[PDB]
Write a protein that binds this ligand. Structure first.
Ligand SMILES: CN(C)C/C=C/C(=O)Nc1ccc(C(=O)Nc2cccc(Nc3cc(-c4c[nH]c5ccccc45)ncn3)c2)cc1
Length: 320
């Protein structure tokens, strides 16, 4: 009984479009392998309703899905069933962060991107897909799950969907955006309830990350491979997003058990080691890897990707 209602018409078009894409794909054979043409494909749909469903949906809108075979294969390699994906994005409206949304069940992130971001996604997409194949989906890179263009009421936006780095169930009381460039959160920024700390806050507030030698060695090797892939694509300015769940604070502040998570859903979680001074769960992965060339060149009004990756790896290596 979904109607795709929301106060925001763009969200309705997004919900209707994801519903439509996934149902369309159920009428398209799963190929043995992706072929080059699948990486320049799209589907466009233009809808003009007259005096029909005039309360749930805008009457005039356009929905375009980029490379739908590829994003279907990607979801599959990331362990995501299309019907579940469909349910997560349509059973109830995505929630704003208060320009990014989460699905109502907190599984996926929905971000508005620019058209140069869409062009850069297409430039790295074959290489990205091959890398996901070769690492069997085990990576700290963002998991790109679908990419769309929406048009309603004379407004056009591009959006991309990725897996949430944070738990869909375990709450996060402290997050950092770490780069190795330094980077301090504003006084305004620390006024929020859920501020995004940065490199210098991580150091100055004495933050420790209590994971055992094995988990740390496994994470750093994954990180080094992922960041070397980014350096070859000449990408930079990405961050490590670090979310900390405090078990004891989650309990005092309100069928899986205390501090436990499903590593098949919250794929970035790492438990603290048995002798940590505080019971904690960490969620860590790489975010925001696209260049944003023109957005940043009009923002102004040097470090290369090789250098960037090495500062990055050295900083993360030092704080784990
Ligand atoms: C306890 N009490 C409150 C009751 C609980 C209520 C409750 O359950 N609500 C709730 C819970 C969790 C949240 C939440 O999880 N918030 C959050 C905040 C910052 C970052 C991220 N993750 C991200 C970001 C990006 C990302 C960055 N930049 C990008 C550029 C392009 C593409 C993607 C990206 N990617 C992947 N994960 C998630 C929101 C609401």
């Amino acid at each position: 009984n979904l109607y795709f209602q929301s106060m925001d018409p763009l969200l309705s078009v997004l919900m209707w479009g994801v519903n439509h894409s996934i149902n369309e794909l159920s009428h398209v054979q799963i190929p043995v392998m992706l072929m080059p043409d699948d990486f320049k494909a799209y589907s466009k749909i233009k809808v003009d309703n007259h005096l029909f469903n005039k309360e749930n949906m805008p009457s005039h809108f356009k929905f375009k899905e980029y490379c739908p075979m590829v994003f279907r294969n990607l979801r599959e390699r990331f362990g995501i069933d299309d019907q579940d994906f469909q349910n997560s994005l349509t059973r109830s409206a995505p929630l704003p962060n208060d320009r990014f949304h989460t699905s109502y069940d907190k599984r996926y992130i929905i971000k508005t991107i620019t058209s140069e971001d869409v062009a850069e996604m297409h430039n790295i997409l074959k290489k990205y897909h091959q890398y996901i194949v070769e690492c069997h989906g085990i990576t700290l890179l963002p998991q790109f799950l679908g990419m769309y263009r929406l048009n309603v009421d004379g407004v056009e936006i591009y959006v991309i969907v990725t897996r949430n780095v944070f738990s869909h169930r375990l709450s996060v009381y402290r997050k950092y955006d770490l780069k190795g460039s330094t980077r301090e959160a504003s006084d305004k920024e620390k006024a929020k309830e859920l501020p995004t700390l940065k490199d210098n806050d991580f150091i100055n507030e004495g933050q420790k990350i209590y994971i055992d030698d094995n988990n740390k060695k496994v994470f750093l090797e994954k990180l080094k491979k992922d960041v070397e892939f980014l350096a070859q694509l000449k990408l930079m300015d990405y961050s490590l997003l670090v979310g900390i769940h405090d078990v004891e604070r989650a309990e005092q502040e309100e069928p899986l058990a205390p501090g436990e998570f499903d590593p098949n859903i919250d794929v970035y979680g790492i438990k603290c080691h048995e002798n940590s001074p505080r019971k904690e769960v960490y969620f860590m992965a790489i975010i925001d890897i696209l260049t944003h060339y023109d957005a940043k060149k009009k923002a102004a009004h040097t470090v290369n990707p090789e250098q960037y990756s090495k500062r990055f790896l050295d900083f993360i290596g030092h704080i784990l």
